[PDB]
Design an enzyme around this catalytic site. Structure first.
Site, short mmCIF file in Angstrom:
data_model
loop_
_atom_site.label_atom_id
_atom_site.label_comp_id
_atom_site.label_asym_id
_atom_site.label_seq_id
_atom_site.Cartn_x
_atom_site.Cartn_y
_atom_site.Cartn_z
N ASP A 140 29.33 -58.75 -15.07
CA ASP A 140 28.67 -57.76 -14.10
C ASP A 140 29.81 -57.52 -12.44
O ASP A 140 29.09 -56.92 -11.33
CB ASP A 140 27.24 -57.74 -13.32
CG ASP A 140 27.05 -56.51 -13.41
OD1 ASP A 140 27.48 -55.56 -13.18
OD2 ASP A 140 26.05 -56.76 -12.89
N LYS A 143 34.89 -53.44 -12.55
CA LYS A 143 34.84 -52.56 -13.72
C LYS A 143 36.80 -53.38 -14.54
O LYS A 143 36.56 -53.57 -15.81
CB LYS A 143 34.47 -51.28 -13.86
CG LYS A 143 35.74 -50.67 -12.56
CD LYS A 143 35.30 -49.36 -12.31
CE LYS A 143 35.57 -48.59 -10.60
NZ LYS A 143 37.54 -48.05 -11.37
N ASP A 168 27.41 -55.03 -18.21
CA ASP A 168 26.64 -54.33 -17.72
C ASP A 168 27.36 -52.90 -17.40
O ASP A 168 29.11 -53.12 -17.00
CB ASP A 168 25.74 -55.16 -16.72
CG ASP A 168 24.83 -54.27 -15.55
OD1 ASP A 168 24.75 -53.36 -16.35
OD2 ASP A 168 24.72 -53.66 -14.47
N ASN A 169 27.46 -52.18 -17.26
CA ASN A 169 27.37 -50.95 -16.13
C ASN A 169 28.53 -50.57 -17.68
O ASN A 169 29.52 -50.16 -16.83
CB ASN A 169 28.47 -50.96 -15.13
CG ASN A 169 26.85 -51.71 -14.33
OD1 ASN A 169 27.06 -52.53 -13.24
ND2 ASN A 169 25.82 -50.54 -13.60
N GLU A 198 18.04 -44.29 -12.44
CA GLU A 198 17.17 -43.20 -11.05
C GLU A 198 18.67 -42.32 -10.51
O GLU A 198 19.02 -43.28 -10.11
CB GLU A 198 16.27 -44.21 -9.98
CG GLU A 198 14.90 -45.05 -11.58
CD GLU A 198 14.06 -45.96 -10.58
OE1 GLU A 198 13.80 -45.69 -9.71
OE2 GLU A 198 13.39 -47.02 -10.85
N1 SFG Z 1 37.38 -59.95 -9.47
C1 SFG Z 1 35.35 -60.45 -9.06
N2 SFG Z 1 35.40 -62.11 -8.86
C2 SFG Z 1 34.39 -62.52 -8.38
N3 SFG Z 1 33.28 -61.62 -7.91
C3 SFG Z 1 34.08 -60.28 -7.75
C4 SFG Z 1 34.75 -59.57 -9.22
N4 SFG Z 1 35.26 -58.17 -8.42
C5 SFG Z 1 33.66 -57.74 -7.83
N5 SFG Z 1 33.04 -58.65 -7.51
C6 SFG Z 1 31.90 -58.85 -7.10
O1 SFG Z 1 30.88 -57.86 -7.90
C7 SFG Z 1 29.76 -58.26 -7.75
C8 SFG Z 1 29.35 -56.62 -8.40
C9 SFG Z 1 27.56 -56.56 -8.39
N6 SFG Z 1 27.40 -55.49 -9.12
C10 SFG Z 1 26.58 -57.61 -8.84
C11 SFG Z 1 25.08 -57.59 -8.91
C12 SFG Z 1 24.43 -58.45 -9.68
N7 SFG Z 1 24.66 -58.95 -10.87
C13 SFG Z 1 23.29 -57.66 -9.40
O2 SFG Z 1 22.68 -57.66 -10.96
O3 SFG Z 1 22.56 -58.22 -8.51
C14 SFG Z 1 29.62 -58.06 -6.20
O4 SFG Z 1 29.12 -58.97 -5.33
C15 SFG Z 1 31.22 -58.28 -6.20
O5 SFG Z 1 31.92 -58.92 -4.61
K K Z 2 29.82 -54.14 -13.12
#
Ligand code: SFG
Ligand code: K
Ligand code: K
Ligand code: K
EC number: 2.1.1.6
Length: 219
Positions: A140, A143, A168-169, A198
């Site tokens: 997650d 991408k 996810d996503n 939403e």
């Molecule tokens: N290469 C990466 N390694 C570690 N963390 C990352 C990386 N790219 C993005 N992130 C982190 O991935 C997260 C993405 C969020 N969508 C996570 C949502 C969380 N899983 C939830 O359900 O609330 C962010 O907090 C980013 O800082």
């Molecule tokens: K994601």
């Protein structure tokens, strides 16, 4: 002005019940719905996540991307005593909020937040963190790293036959190259689950991809 993340933690601390993970999830979702932060409402994807944890009962889970700890709380609340979630989060400010979130939920002992980029930490799991293989991976994060980090996990020997990937996503904003790989590969058995967002009123989705072991070393 105030960050989203500091406000999410504030809302939980003011409204949820300490040591009640369900109340923490519901508070985050309530606040993020009211703010119309579509990607931060987890209750639709959470139904799918819960079912995966209930079916497979993983002892060691790796999460890529923690943010404020919603998905870590969601999964960890269903893990067995002694089981472990490792969550990789490259933004230390987000790691800090996640830590506070876990403490409030009472789940801090089940979760280890690894601060850094997944591409840097994954190669350290075997030797630095004494990992054999993962039972489940929740993807997650960024991408464009879903496919590269899956390949990296493979190469580093961190997947076994039976390891469950849940991404996810995969539709919005999308991970089409990851989907094409796992669906096309004999090393993964895949299942797709629809999950609504939403405001955008769009059907996103999650992909479950269960690793089958590596392909033959030969042609
Ligand atoms: N290469 C990466 N390694 C570690 N963390 C990352 C990386 N790219 C993005 N992130 C982190 O991935 C997260 C993405 C969020 N969508 C996570 C949502 C969380 N899983 C939830 O359900 O609330 C962010 O907090 C980013 O800082
Ligand atoms: K994601
Ligand atoms: K288990
Ligand atoms: K396949």
């Amino acid at each position: 002005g105030d960050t989203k993340e500091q406000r999410i933690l504030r809302y939980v601390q003011q409204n949820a019940k300490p040591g009640d993970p369900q109340s923490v999830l519901e508070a985050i979702d309530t606040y993020c719905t009211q703010k119309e932060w579509a990607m931060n409402v987890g209750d639709a994807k959470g139904q799918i996540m819960d079912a995966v944890i209930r079916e497979y009962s993983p002892s060691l889970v790796l999460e890529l991307g923690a943010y404020c700890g919603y998905s870590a709380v969601r999964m960890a609340r269903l893990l067995q005593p002694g089981a472990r979630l490792l969550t990789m989060e490259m933004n230390p400010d987000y790691a800090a909020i996640t830590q506070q979130m876990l403490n409030f939920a009472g789940l801090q002992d089940k979760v280890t937040i690894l601060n850094g980029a997944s591409q840097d930490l994954i190669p350290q799991l075997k030797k630095k963190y004494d990992v054999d293989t993962l039972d489940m991976v929740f993807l997650d994060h960024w991408k464009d790293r879903y496919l590269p980090d899956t390949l990296l996990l493979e190469k580093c020997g961190l997947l076994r036959k039976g390891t469950v990937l849940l991404a996810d996503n995969v539709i919005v904003p999308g991970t089409p190259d990851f989907l094409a790989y796992v669906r096309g590969s004999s090393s993964f058995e895949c299942t797709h689950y629809s999950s609504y967002l939403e405001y955008m009123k769009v059907v996103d989705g999650l992909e479950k991809a269960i690793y089958q072991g590596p392909s033959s070393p030969d042609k």
